[PDB]
Amino acid sequence: AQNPNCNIMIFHPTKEEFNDFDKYIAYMESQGAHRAGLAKIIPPKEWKARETYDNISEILIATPLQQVASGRAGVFTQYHKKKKAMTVGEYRHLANSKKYQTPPHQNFEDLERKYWKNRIYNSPIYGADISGSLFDENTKQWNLGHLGTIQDLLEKECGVVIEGVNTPYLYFGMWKTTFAWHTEDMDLYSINYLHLGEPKTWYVVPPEHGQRLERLARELFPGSSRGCGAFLRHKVALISPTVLKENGIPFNRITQEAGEFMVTFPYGYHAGFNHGFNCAEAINFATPRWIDYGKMASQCSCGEARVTFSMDAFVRILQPERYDLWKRGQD
């Protein structure tokens, strides 16, 4: 078996190998990359996502989210308070303010220490899930706005034609902005490109050990666990690496820098934080190997997790028994 310790792999494709997305994902998996839950892909040196980022300040962040923490430094939840709309220019200015900026630090490890020590005592503002793309239409390779769609994958593999579309989303982050422990909707893959700015640190549990994370999470968030059988779909729970180590949960960590791709694999739980002002673009995608994960994915039926028009069709076709009760959560 390739990659039996489930280490995060880093790939360096040539421009020639960067021409066929599906075939490169298949290559990565041949080398065991999926076992970790997360891989990094460094694009060829000749590739660029677009010519410059000089004209992005007028993008609107219609609902910035203030991420308010509760709990203890190692084990907390965050709630997202809606703030008034601001442009990307306004947001970058706010991110760079004395109140919100990244503190002085030695290296990524000192900054990670400061994050886990101090996160709960601040409420950074996140511009998340903004439909859109920053790829130039003339970028032909690994353009997250031109991938083949999950609907077409289901059609090619399974023969069923469904409604729905699949488009990318932009994330504008600042110091301490946080993504809680989750897998993707319907345990899909995701791909994330860091377009500009400061890094993003990721933590990931191997898919083969996801249930161990869930068991710990039920113990650490006992009331949430009673209220919903898949409460990590709410995307509010944080657990530090120290706590994961104390409880024997296998995981890995890696820092993504501007100009690099990350791929998360089906049922790879991940969490992380941003080092300072940045902009990422991400989209879900599927392969043939995904199909059985889609059939087995947990679902939120307390109704908190509340998810897309397009995810309806996936649940209807892959999880017809759940469909009924699931749609009660979403209506």
Ligand X SMILES: O=C(O)CNC(=O)C(=O)O
CB of 190 to Ni ion, least distance (A): 5
Among the listed residues 91, 179, 251, 314, the single contact to ligand X using CB under 6 A: 179
304 lies in the binding site for Zn ion (CB under 5 A): yes
* CA separation for the pair 116, 273 (Å, rounded): 10
Instruction: Pick one of Mg ion, ligand X, Zn ion, none as the site partner of residue 58 (Cβ within 5 to 8 A by kind).
Output: Mg ion
* Beta carbons of 236 and 79 less than 8 angstroms apart: yes
The 3-state DSSP class for residue 56 equals coil
Alpha helices in the chain (DSSP H): 21-30, 88-95, 108-118, 150-158, 210-220, 222-227, 241-246, 290-296, 309-318, 323-329
Q: Which residue is nearest to Ni ion (CB)?
A: 190
Q: Which amino acid is at 48?
A: K
Instruction: Tell me how far, at minimum, the Cβ of 277 lies from ligand X, in Å.
Output: 13
**Residue 195, marked binder:** no
C-alpha 319/C-alpha 225 separation (Å) is: 22
DSSP code of residue 34: G
Give the integer Cα–Cα distance in Å for 17 and 223: 48
Q: Interface with Mg ion includes 321 (CB under 5 A)?
A: no
Q: Restricting to residues 148-177, which ones interact with ligand X according to CB under 6 A?
A: 171
Within 13 Å of residue 317, how many CA atoms lie on the same side as its CB?
A: 20
> Contact positions toward Ni ion, by CB under 5 A?
190
Is 298 a residue that touches ligand X (CB under 6 A)? no
Q: In angstroms, what is the minimal distance from the CB of 159 to ligand X?
A: 28
- Smaller CB separation from ligand X, 146 or 316: 146
- Known binding residue 6? Answer is no
Q: Mask of contacts with ligand X, 187-216, x by CB under 6 A? A: ---x-x------------------------
Residue 264 lies near ligand X (rule: CB under 6 A)? yes
Annotation-wise, does 100 bind a ligand? no
Question: Among residues 180 and 228, whose Cβ is nearest to ligand X?
Answer: 180
Q: Residue 99, annotated ligand binder?
A: no
Give Cβ neighbours of residue 98 (< 8 Å, ≥ 6 apart): none
Q: In this structure, which amino acid lies at residue 77?
A: T
Residues within window 33-62 making contact with Mg ion, judged by CB under 5 A: 56, 58
80 is in an annotated binding site: no
Residue 300, annotated as binding a ligand: yes
Task: Choose among 289, 310, 300: nearest CA to 330.
Answer: 300
> What are the start-end ranges of the E strands in the chain?
9-11, 38-41, 60-61, 65-72, 75-82, 86-87, 125-131, 169-173, 178-182, 189-197, 200-204, 237-239, 252-256, 261-264, 270-274, 278-285
Q: Does 299 bind ligand X (CB under 6 A)?
A: no
Nearer to Zn ion, 17 or 312 (CB): 312
The answer to whether 192 is annotated as binding is yes
Positions touching ligand X (CB under 6 A) are: 171, 179, 190, 192, 264, 270, 280, 282
Positions touching Zn ion (CB under 5 A) are: 228, 300, 302, 304
Positions touching Mg ion (CB under 5 A) are: 56, 58
Residue ranges of the binding site for Zn(2+): 228, 234, 300, 302
Residue ranges of the binding site for 2-oxoglutarate: 126, 192, 200, 235
